[PDB]
Design a protein around this ligand. Structure first.
Ligand code: BGC
Ligand code: BGC
Lengths: 822, 822
């Protein structure tokens, strides 16, 4: 069934009940300030780093889930309820939650009083703004008192959750009931010492009362749903001293029949130069100048609407680079709105903070952020360019690099492991995608240091040679690249052999020696190594280029000679040179990663989709038969049923979940693309629909998570929970699926010198038009698609047929019309 | 204002209401398995290590506090309530929680049904047993269904709370409704991989139903107080697959008026040898042999009662070594029961897990465990001996040592800092105390490695020499010991100068250079260096001893020459060589640590308590005047009002809390002892009463925490929360206060060759008798105390007068009657 519906004209998902299978959230902000907001006002906000600068507290695995956030307690004649339903759970006459692009609206109505709240992070602002509209829907005048509520976090989320022996005595706040634009509360924990920042929580009106101490506001023995203050109907004007600081204002409202009133609340992040931190000589009063300015910028509903309009224009402009109009509205919906929206989120968040990733140990992964670029370069190329520079700056002189870096400092760390041999090549993938998109070859000349070291700068292209050379010089006995800690699959640890519980397979020291090789890195090298070669040729390096393509040829040969099992590609060779992912073994006979990536690299591709002799065709057929399910393709089959000490973390998961038999959505688009390469568009489009949000909305009670964004994994067959997803939002499957549908299914993909139009989506989408802005020109691509198996397009440009499927880039400001016949 | 009372005869603290100022807990277990149990059944259990082997989940800073633990939902004709009050909070006709030694009883009654639960960890068992007795107190037959409940933790507490991206898919259980002694549930997360252990939760009867999935038991949108299963009146027989495993059984009972029924539940920790892990050849079913045996040892109420009586005898024996009988029942209560009970707990827990310390970052402290030995050696000398060995094994060859070690592996780590220069000398303190107590000189010969390195073994005594030499070879320009990271005071970081927010002062690396010196370590060195000299002389090391005594004299000379501010002792010299803790500064004029420790070391002691010219008297007079409050002695005065970059973490706390103006109870006993040294017993006893539990019970509403145990800190005079405590249970305050009252106030203390009897407690305790078992002999010490200042005792033994106050140890098996006159 469903718990809501898409509203395409408004670019929102409408949740019609608070009783969803799981908390469904939205991300506010797209610059440096972010907020996680559930359809029940749950979540938290942070500035740049969810671990080091978290403004508000949020409890993971709470009972019940998501029982804390931005609340507005309404007391109407003694009756207390919250429009977000939770935490009070009063019966509401009406309830609706709309998640839009960069903003959300939550509305609850009870006994003649409707309360709607608009949540969003304004462009250029480090704050979350709430515009509350309370309306009297009865035929008689009403009065009520509204109590706002937000629980602060002590900035360092990790410290906040574990170091009470210290932090229960450091909570500090300041109260300003009579500010220039209304009342405001200041959370200044540790501002006394090393912090040059504080948070503010204010409203555009002089509040009747306030509260900053949670225990006083909530009351002993009470949950947020039984908060004492709202029930009493009067603030306690508590001034916190240690323990748990909060922000709360009481506002008395009076409304004639049909009359409404707006209230604007602001949660802001402020900083002061060290030499202007205090308002007094005694250094006891925080300088509120920046806070006042901010509150002044959102003192009226007109300012809020103006900012919301700018955010709308912002998104209209971002989404104008790639769009499609076809016969499939679920497809259009994904392509024009949601997939691109999610790509903005993953670009900004990586895999750090969601309702699954706790925003503590994970920052910006090297592999993750490079891949996120693939689906983000068309949105804001300049930010992609800077990201590439930041990512490459955490690379080592020998080619390898830190697996991730801390958001706040942009410095690498080993917190979640090191020495993953697939990491280096991803840098080449991200740069190539960026050059193809923007044509900014100058980026290759950008000076980039190694591990942020002063004096170690070399041109970015040199960094790429280091990455390319790292693989060529780290191949094993079969000519395949050594896997190291692991490859794309973090759970394939062939140099681990751990028997000690508790220690993460991710950071437990690997064993020296062995000949563990990866077939995945082999295909990855064949694919991106070829791009490296092209980048070198363009720079005039015939020497470097020529050698590079030789190595690519050697590894390609190695894959066919030593990485072929008979009906599908081998996965790897373990520490002892034993094959992994072979039909000879009882479990884990076939692994999906190499099948998709090898064919993407053109390995084993025959003369056509019906060439049942080509290994690429055999591999894909095997994938379909052994890994296919109604919810997507599982990682490997059969799943491991006992701990395989030589394979690492993989077999530690019960069958059907995560890397052991689960549908790891991220690698499904690789098979999708592989199928388009071989010329089987119908099957590729089929796989796309099995895991895409819009197509799975009708089974929301099974998927359970958000119906408008991709998740990391869906329980595979073999799991009692088959079809149920976990880890929504933060996943590379967003970037890879946008790549798949926009560039290979719909077929519009940027190349170095032109735009290739190579549709391969099958018969289910007979006609569509893609509007693509590229290199400053607008391309109107009109496709008439027969869907014929293996049939590829022929183009006519501006009234004249052309050869091939690559349209040379037209000059900026131009508008070219290409007619496509497939 | 009280919420209960002491029951001396039963050795319990009786809590008469569930509405306490804060959750009040008891610790179950004294060997390898421990349980934190609040008066509302809240808390959790773990095996040896709270971070690595935590059986059950507990949420710190939950709303409301302590909502989660061992619950028993009672469904009486549709009405659902819990005897522990929380989480349902149904009105109870009667409620009472009794915390005893190693066990607790919680009783709740509602509408004709009384439910009593006995909680405890049996000796020699790694489990928590619950004996539940249900009684029909009405005049008509009753039928009710009891639902047990406990939420499992995924072993690694840190992973459990932060790695959901993985662990929401690994939870695994096994259900055994028809076991040999009743029904049982097995929590076996990760047993399929590296863990050789699992937990069991069973009941001594065949249950009507069960539940292993939290969400199914509790229900969507519900808190534990609104659990659906109990409300429905029957188990859902849920079998978990990932998410949140729980243990729950349902038992229907029918009781005639006045009839009662017993049910015995068991939460156990089981291990299996690798070759005995599975019941099947396919390795899918856990071998339950050890679990079946455990459940068999507690299948009857008779077995429970026998184990409880064994526990009672165990404590009677432990408390028979030192006890007193005076005219003060609060004093007696503390000395005979509670202070000693707490010392066993600190010995076992160090500072790792309480309702404040989270059982994650902290293991067994080097400084902490050495000091706890001071109040534990008389209880179980054999276990203190091993602890000394384990501690010394984490020491480095140069004398320095790991600041703490992981409880499960006994290996040190730098998780909470490194290079604390006071650490080394504490090892000598612990060993000296142990030898004086047991006369086990052989321990100095025990082979002991450095940093657990096999083959690096060296006599324990040699480790002491390393500690001694470390201080000798690390003195500054004034001849005082270099402070390093920090001394006893973790917040006096003079080599820090941090301006980077969020990074712990404890772990942030420090700056080389400077001349920062510590007066505290100087005093510490004089005190324990003297002990080292004695041990060296007794070992036959005449020259080493002579040398040692020489170094000791130099350090004490430096204290009086470079560590005296005029009216009190200086605290230290900063990185720049400037004095810390001087009247020349506006804040932090006088610090308490050096005042108490220097005098304890005898530095500055004059002709008597009336000698106003003796520095020791001036110092203590300054302490009384500037640091004294009705709740104890504050750490320093005035507290710092702005961040002092050269002092480290200390000034980061708001005035009046923790190390910045708070009453850090741990250092109060040093001033208490100092006072008995200068001959002012009345003042010393006064200070003892200010911070002692039994004396603060009458103001439970202000202390707020447990009224039967010491806390780490009580808010100081500069705090708005003055008088309010934080961090109860785990503190060196327990061991040090026991040392103070048992050895210096009451005056009975062990020496190398005899038992010292030197009372110095003032006129408030005119007569008392101490029964002390030492070196296998019993000493009945009858004291007639005038309490006159400066007055020291004269003794008579078995009818004859003796010289001085030291009674040479009598042969084992004898009873010595000492008559003391003061
Ligand atoms: O790491 C433990 C230390 O942490 C510091 O922040 C606290 O102020 C000390 O009281 C404590 O001993
Ligand atoms: O640390 C991150 C990694 O943790 C592993 O436990 C998971 O199986 C991986 O999916 C994840 O990438």
């Amino acid at each position: 069934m469903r718990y809501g519906h898409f509203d395409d004209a408004a670019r929102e998902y409408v949740i019609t009940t608070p009783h969803t299978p799981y908390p469904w959230i939205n991300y506010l902000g797209s610059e440096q300030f972010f907020s996680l907001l559930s359809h029940q006002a749950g979540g938290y906000s942070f500035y740049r780093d969810a671990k080091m600068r978290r403004l508000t507290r949020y409890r993971y695995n709470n009972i019940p889930a998501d029982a804390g956030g931005r609340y507005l307690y309404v007391n109407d004649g003694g009756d207390v309820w919250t429009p977000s339903w939770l935490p009070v759970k009063a019966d509401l006459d009406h309830f609706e939650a709309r998640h839009g692009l960069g903003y959300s609206r939550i509305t609850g109505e009870r006994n003649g009083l409707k309360v709607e709240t608009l949540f969003f992070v304004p462009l250029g602002e480090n704050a979350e703004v709430q515009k509350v509209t309370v309306t009297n829907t009865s035929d008689a005048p009403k009065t009520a008192t509204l109590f706002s509520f937000v629980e602060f976090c002590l900035w360092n989320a990790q410290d906040d959750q574990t170091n009470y022996q210290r932090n229960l005595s450091i909570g500090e706040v300041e109260v300003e009931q009579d500010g220039p634009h209304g009342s405001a509360i200041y959370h200044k924990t540790e501002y006394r010492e090393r912090r040059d920042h504080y948070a503010v929580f204010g409203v555009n009106t002089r509040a009747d009362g306030f509260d900053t101490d949670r225990d006083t506001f909530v009351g002993a023995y009470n949950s947020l749903g039984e908060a004492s203050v709202p029930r009493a109907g009067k603030s306690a004007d508590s001034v916190a001293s240690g323990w748990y600081p909060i922000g709360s204002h009481s506002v008395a409202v009076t409304l004639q029949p049909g009359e409404s009133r707006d209230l604007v609340y602001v949660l802001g992040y402020l900083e002061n130069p060290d030499e202007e931190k205090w308002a007094d000589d005694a250094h006891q009063v925080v300088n509120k100048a920046p806070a006042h300015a901010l509150l002044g910028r959102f003192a009226t509903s007109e300012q809020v609407d103006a900012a919301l309009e700018a955010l709308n224009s912002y998104w209209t402009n971002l989404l104008s680079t790639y769009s499609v109009s076809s016969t499939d509205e679920k497809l259009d919906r994904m392509v024009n709105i949601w997939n691109q929206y999610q790509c903005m989120v993953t670009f900004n968040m990586s895999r750090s903070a969601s309702f699954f990733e706790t925003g503590i140990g994970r920052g910006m992964g090297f592999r993750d952020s490079n891949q996120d670029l693939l689906g983000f370069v068309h949105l804001i190329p300049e930010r992609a360019r800077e990201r590439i520079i930041d990512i490459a700056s955490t690379q080592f002189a020998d080619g390898s690099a830190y697996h991730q870096y801390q958001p706040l400092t942009k410095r690498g760390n080993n917190d979640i492991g090191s020495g993953f041999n697939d990491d280096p090549l991803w840098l080449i993938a991200g740069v190539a995608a960026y050059i193809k998109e923007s044509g900014d070859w100058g980026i290759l000349d950008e000076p980039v240091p190694f591990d942020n070291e002063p004096g170690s700068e070399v041109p970015l292209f040199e960094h790429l040679t280091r990455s390319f050379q790292f693989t060529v010089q780290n191949r094993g006995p079969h000519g395949l690249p050594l896997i190291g800690r692991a490859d794309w699959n973090d759970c394939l640890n062939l140099n681990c052999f751990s028997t000690t519980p508790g220690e993460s397979f991710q950071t437990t020291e690997n064993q020296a020696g062995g000949v563990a090789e990866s077939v995945f890195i082999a295909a990855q090298f064949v694919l991106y190594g070829a791009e490296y070669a092209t980048l070198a040729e363009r720079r005039g390096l015939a020497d470097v280029a020529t050698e590079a393509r030789k190595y690519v040829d050697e590894v390609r040969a190695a894959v066919l000679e030593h990485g072929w099992d008979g009906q599908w590609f081998l996965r790897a060779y373990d520490y002892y040179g034993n094959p992994v992912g072979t039909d000879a073994k009882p479990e884990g006979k076939i692994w999906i990663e190499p099948q998709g990536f090898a064919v993407m690299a053109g390995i084993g591709v025959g003369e056509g989709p019906d060439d049942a002799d080509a290994p690429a065709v055999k591999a894909l057929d095997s994938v379909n038969e052994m890994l296919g399910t109604p919810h997507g393709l599982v990682l490997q089959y059969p799943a491991y049923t006992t701990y395989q000490i030589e394979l690492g973390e993989v077999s530690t998961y019960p069958p059907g979940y995560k890397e052991n038999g689960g549908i790891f959505c991220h690698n499904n688009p690789w098979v999708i693309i592989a199928e388009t390469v071989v010329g089987r568009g119908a099957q590729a489009f089929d796989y796309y629909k099995r895991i895409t949000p819009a197509y799975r909305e009708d089974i929301s009670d099974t998927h359970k998570l958000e119906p408008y964004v991709y998740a990391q994994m869906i329980a595979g067959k073999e799991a009692v929970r088959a079809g149920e997803a976990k880890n929504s939002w933060l996943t590379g499957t967003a970037a890879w699926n946008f790549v798949a549908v926009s560039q290979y299914l719909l077929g519009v993909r940027p190349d170095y010198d032109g735009l290739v139009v190579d549709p391969q989506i099958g018969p289910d989408v007979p006609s569509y038009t893609v509007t693509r802005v590229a290199r400053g020109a607008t391309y109107e691509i009109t496709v008439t698609n027969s869907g014929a198996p293996g049939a590829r397009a022929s183009l006519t440009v501006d009234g004249a047929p052309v050869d091939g499927r690559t349209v040379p880039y037209a000059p900026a400001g131009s508008t070219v019309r290409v007619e496509v016949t497939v």
